[PDB]
Amino acid sequence: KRGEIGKVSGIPEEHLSRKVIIYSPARTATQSGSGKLGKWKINFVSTLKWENPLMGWTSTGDPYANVGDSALAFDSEEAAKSFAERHGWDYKVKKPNTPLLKVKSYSDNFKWKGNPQPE
Amino acid sequence: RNPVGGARVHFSNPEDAIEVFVDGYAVKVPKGFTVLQACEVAGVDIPRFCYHSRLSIAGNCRMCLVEVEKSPKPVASCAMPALPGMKIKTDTPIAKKAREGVMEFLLMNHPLDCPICDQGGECDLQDQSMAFGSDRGRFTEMKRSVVDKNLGPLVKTVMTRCIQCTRCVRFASEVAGVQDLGILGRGSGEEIGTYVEKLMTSELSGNVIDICPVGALTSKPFAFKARNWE
Amino acid sequence: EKTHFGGLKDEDRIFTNLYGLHDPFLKGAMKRGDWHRTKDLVLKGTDWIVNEMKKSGLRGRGGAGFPSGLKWSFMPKVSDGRPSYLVVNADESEPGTCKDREIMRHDPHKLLEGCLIAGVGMRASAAYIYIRGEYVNERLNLEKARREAYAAGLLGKNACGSGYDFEVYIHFGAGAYICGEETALLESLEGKQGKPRLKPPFPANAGLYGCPTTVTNVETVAVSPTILRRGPEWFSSFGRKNNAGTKLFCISGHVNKPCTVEEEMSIPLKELIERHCGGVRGGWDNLLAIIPGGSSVPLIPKNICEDVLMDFDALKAVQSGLGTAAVIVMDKSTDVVDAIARLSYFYKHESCGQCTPCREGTGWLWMIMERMKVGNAKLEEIDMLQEVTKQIEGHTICALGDAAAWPVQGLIRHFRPELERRIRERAERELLQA
Amino acid sequence: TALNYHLDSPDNKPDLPWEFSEANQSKVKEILSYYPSNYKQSAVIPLLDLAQQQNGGWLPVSAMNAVAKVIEVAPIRVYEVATFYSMFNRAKVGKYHLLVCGTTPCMIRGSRDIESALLDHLGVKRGEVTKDGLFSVGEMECMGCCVNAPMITVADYSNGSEGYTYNYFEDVTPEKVVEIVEKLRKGEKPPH
Amino acid sequence: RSKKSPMELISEVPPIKVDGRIVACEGDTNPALGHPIEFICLDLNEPAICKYCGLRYVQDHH
Amino acid sequence: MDNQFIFKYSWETLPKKWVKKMERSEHGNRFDTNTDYLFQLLCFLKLHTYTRVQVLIDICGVDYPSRKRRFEVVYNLLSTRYNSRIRVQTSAD
Numbered sequence A: 001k002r003g004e005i006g007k008v009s010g011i012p013e014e015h016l017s018r019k020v021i022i023y024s025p026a027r028t029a030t031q032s033g034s035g036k037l038g039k040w041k042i043n044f045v046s047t048l049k050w051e052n053p054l055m056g057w058t059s060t061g062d063p064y065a066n067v068g069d070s071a072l073a074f075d076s077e078e079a080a081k082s083f084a085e086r087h088g089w090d091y092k093v094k095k096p097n098t099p100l101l102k103v104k105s106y107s108d109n110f111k112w113k114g115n116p117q118p119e
Numbered sequence B: 001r002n003p004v005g006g007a008r009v010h011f012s013n014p015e016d017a018i019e020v021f022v023d024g025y026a027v028k029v030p031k032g033f034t035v036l037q038a039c040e041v042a043g044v045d046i047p048r049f050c051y052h053s054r055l056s057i058a059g060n061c062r063m064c065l066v067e068v069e070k071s072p073k074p075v076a077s078c079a080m081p082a083l084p085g086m087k088i089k090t091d092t093p094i095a096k097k098a099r100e101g102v103m104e105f106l107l108m109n110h111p112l113d114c115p116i117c118d119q120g121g122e123c124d125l126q127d128q129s130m131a132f133g134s135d136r137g138r139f140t141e142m143k144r145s146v147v148d149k150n151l152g153p154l155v156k157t158v159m160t161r162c163i164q165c166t167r168c169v170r171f172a173s174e175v176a177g178v179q180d181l182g183i184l185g186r187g188s189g190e191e192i193g194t195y196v197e198k199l200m201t202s203e204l205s206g207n208v209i210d211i212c213p214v215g216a217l218t219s220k221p222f223a224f225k226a227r228n229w230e
Numbered sequence C: 001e002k003t004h005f006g007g008l009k010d011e012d013r014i015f016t017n018l019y020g021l022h023d024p025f026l027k028g029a030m031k032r033g034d035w036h037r038t039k040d041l042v043l044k045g046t047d048w049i050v051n052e053m054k055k056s057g058l059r060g061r062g063g064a065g066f067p068s069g070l071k072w073s074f075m076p077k078v079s080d081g082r083p084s085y086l087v088v089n090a091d092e093s094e095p096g097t098c099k100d101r102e103i104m105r106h107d108p109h110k111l112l113e114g115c116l117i118a119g120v121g122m123r124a125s126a127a128y129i130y131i132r133g134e135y136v137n138e139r140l141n142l143e144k145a146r147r148e149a150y151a152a153g154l155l156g157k158n159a160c161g162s163g164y165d166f167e168v169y170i171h172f173g174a175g176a177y178i179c180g181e182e183t184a185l186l187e188s189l190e191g192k193q194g195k196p197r198l199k200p201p202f203p204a205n206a207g208l209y210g211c212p213t214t215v216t217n218v219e220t221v222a223v224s225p226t227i228l229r230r231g232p233e234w235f236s237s238f239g240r241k242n243n244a245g246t247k248l249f250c251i252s253g254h255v256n257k258p259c260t261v262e263e264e265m266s267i268p269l270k271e272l273i274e275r276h277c278g279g280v281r282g283g284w285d286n287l288l289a290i291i292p293g294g295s296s297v298p299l300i301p302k303n304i305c306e307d308v309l310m311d312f313d314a315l316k317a318v319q320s321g322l323g324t325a326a327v328i329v330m331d332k333s334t335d336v337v338d339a340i341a342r343l344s345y346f347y348k349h350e351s352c353g354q355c356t357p358c359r360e361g362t363g364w365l366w367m368i369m370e371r372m373k374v375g376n377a378k379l380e381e382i383d384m385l386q387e388v389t390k391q392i393e394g395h396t397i398c399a400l401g402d403a404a405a406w407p408v409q410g411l412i413r414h415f416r417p418e419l420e421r422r423i424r425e426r427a428e429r430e431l432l433q434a
Numbered sequence D: 001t002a003l004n005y006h007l008d009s010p011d012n013k014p015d016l017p018w019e020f021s022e023a024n025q026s027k028v029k030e031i032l033s034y035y036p037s038n039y040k041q042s043a044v045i046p047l048l049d050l051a052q053q054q055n056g057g058w059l060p061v062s063a064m065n066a067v068a069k070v071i072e073v074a075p076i077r078v079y080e081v082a083t084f085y086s087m088f089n090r091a092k093v094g095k096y097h098l099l100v101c102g103t104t105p106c107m108i109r110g111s112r113d114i115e116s117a118l119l120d121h122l123g124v125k126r127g128e129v130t131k132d133g134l135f136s137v138g139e140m141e142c143m144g145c146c147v148n149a150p151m152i153t154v155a156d157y158s159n160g161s162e163g164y165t166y167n168y169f170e171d172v173t174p175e176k177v178v179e180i181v182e183k184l185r186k187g188e189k190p191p192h
Numbered sequence E: 001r002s003k004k005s006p007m008e009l010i011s012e013v014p015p016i017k018v019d020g021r022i023v024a025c026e027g028d029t030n031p032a033l034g035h036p037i038e039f040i041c042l043d044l045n046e047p048a049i050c051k052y053c054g055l056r057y058v059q060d061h062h
Numbered sequence F: 001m002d003n004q005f006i007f008k009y010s011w012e013t014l015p016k017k018w019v020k021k022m023e024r025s026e027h028g029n030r031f032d033t034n035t036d037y038l039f040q041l042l043c044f045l046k047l048h049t050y051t052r053v054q055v056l057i058d059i060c061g062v063d064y065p066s067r068k069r070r071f072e073v074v075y076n077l078l079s080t081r082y083n084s085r086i087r088v089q090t091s092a093d
Ligand SMILES: Cc1cc2nc3c(=O)[nH]c(=O)nc-3n(C[C@H](O)[C@H](O)[C@H](O)COP(=O)(O)O)c2cc1C
Pocket: C059, C060, C061, C062, C063, C064, C065, C066, C071, C089, C090, C091, C092, C093, C094, C177, C178, C179, C180, C181, C182, C215, C216, C217, C218, C220, C398, C399, C400, C403
């Protein structure tokens, strides 16, 4: 809806109907730092990537292969939604999963373990 | 400020919320919430090697040290419970020189096999060394070494590059539910292993690959296949 | 007096039979004043014992220095289902100290009386004595004494004829220096590796088996019964303000006939060395260095060991505290760098490798000081050693890291010029031979 | 030769059956009785020491599993305990385990002089048993005030859990230590 | 010769004899022109293979 | 002229409604003005006696795809006589 900016962008018209996914990438499991969170990106699904039959190089024909990764990063969900809405893409927002901080204490390691009652 | 990583704080008791000063910015946290978690609430990210939010708290590796105004020694923020009205200090010369001093000890016996480490691009040791570390490097003598003992067809182990953070041991003892991995020895030269020929036979036994920060435990099927950036 | 706190009359001493001149079993202890109407002593209740201990000013031995009254008062007054325990730190590691094995070899019933008195003054259902693993004969003798006391109704249910119940068990380690720590003691006694736990979970709230407990030295509890019987006011007379009492000194080193006598608290070092244990070998003229107390404290050179008082605060003001009170003197005939290097190797050997600064820092200290023992290092390595010791100190879990950093700092502060001398002479040799 | 891994050997392997002796069973029960029933893991140190005494001075992997079954814990939790403490040998030692000079309170007085005599009188390196399984040389820790720099230490593993004895000898001499070795060769014990 | 790939060509080099618990491998005799130094604990009876070079080190003693 | 002197004088001399946002630092004096006052501000900076900005270095442009005014055109200027460098930037769409 409201693809006027999409119309005036000048990009090929056939790429204005692409379905896109909006999400905030989660923290990687292999690292414990949280310096790569809170930034939203549009995920064009550049699925088609065949293999060059000369050297095994990965060829592609999708112009949006790495745009959403290398560039085009948004500081908020609203900005990304407004951007996709302005360019007339059928976006689909995926809310991120956030950790739930729980009361954790060192002393919980060392519990009385009850009373040696017969059982 | 907003919590780092979007972490949600669940106040099971609205009345009990002690107010602390992480770096001069007062925040409210419930009972418990060790100094590390209080800083996590206030948007401050503290280095950590032994502390996993899913396992029991251990105090080794002394990397999350911070300075408290009413404390002579730097305290382990990952273990010291929060108290009302603390004046915590993170960006302080004491709390910094603590971190470089600890990480120098961490790196003094680490092997020089970064180009062949399967966790080269996503290692917490080097990523934190670039930020919270001194660039010079002072150690010059001979390092130690540990031989590699096979365990499992899908967990490739190089225990030479293993900081003894005991995270794998706690995971195997608590989450996995099978007690096969333990810490053996005393002093400089303690090893971690099964002490026998047994392999890790558990359904969720492949999670030791991610939970171990350094490249000591890495997946065997993914041995040297690709780097994280590609 | 106040002018000089030196010399006991040999009848004011409380550790009789210290030389093993008489029987150490129940009969000898009974004839020497043990198990003397202890039921009357325990029937005044817990509060009276704690108040008397506070009045007596009994500073905790074993190197901690914490007052015993304050430590005992920390135990809870009401039992919330969890019984309270008592652990006696009989692990006499850190060699050069032989006072605890002498106490348990010759005065076992005194230790049993002290532990019972402590368990009356702290609401402890049972008490555990953790004997060092190497003390096999001592453990067997103390077990015999314990069963002798049990057969006499002195322990067990209805202890000493009163309504109080006390069970005394025996546990022995397997040769680990770190097991002597306050918390690694409880970890080992719980059935796992002896690695210390973090401090904020204090043993007064979660100790042995997750139950509140208090750890006290065997020497500190052995003086508990005699203090109450002889009166707290009498005990406070020996020494000076807030740190009075009688301390056992295990003198050793380059001296002739080293003794292990018990004397006053604020004993002058010169008087103690030159009165009991003859004199330092070669005379006082050499007196290269001396470690006051155990080896876990910084060294004191020749200049500042004169007119020094063997008190906790008096020594602490000299940046070298008093630990187990077993001095090791060094004559000028021997080098000081080699002894400290061997001490650093010992600290590297016994470190339980839990936290990073102690696990790696002690090894680094050993390597650096082995290198400089032959002088094979640059001149700037001394400041590097100082910085490494500063990094190790204060960032560890237990006090062994500080106990390993302190001797190096003591050597550097007082005996630095020897290091430059060795380094320079080795440099001259290297340039002379090609 | 202190290692933290097994590499199964025909002398010690997990499949071998190890059981506490009938005389030692009463001692096992007495040891277990000193601790609450739910906290049976606390008896690991006394049980391991008793098992080492019974076997003859060394702790095989099967004895560790037997102790683990006795206290009902995972066998790794007993491997950790056995490896941590410097009193469980985990490697075969002859009937007598000689212990050699100690640390720096003693090395100040010249501890490290009496080390080669014990080795060349039997022709075996440290940690290696003689041709017959009687003597071995290992390291020790000083009990305390080590005024006599040359000391030796013996462990009577010949009789087993019954005649086990751990004595410390003071003021040892290179010919005196040979005299003690010969005295222990026939069977009689020296005076301490 | 070129019919022998490094896979089957590095295995024909006999293992190095060295005393001690560990050995430092640098690749070339000049440290700057080799690989990063790699201390390996050669305690197992199998030769310990350097991860960079592929050279095998075995303990002469025992 | 000194960088802080340009700061003080220009901020005092300029009409207040022209400059929405302005910044002083070692990197460079910045005048973030509105999109319609840009011509007038440039004319004032070109002709005023104390601030004689005679040469325009370049007209830049930065794309911020996260704000309502996506683009931002930057005008780098130079005063040859007084040896100063001023930077004026606005927001576009
Ligand atoms: C590394 C370390 C080793 C220790 N070893 C002993 C020891 O062998 N014997 C002892 O009585 N105290 C030792 N201590 C001091 C203990 O903390 C002490 O036994 C305990 O705190 C009781 O002290 P108290 O007698 O003042 O109550 C050691 C402390 C540390 C940090």
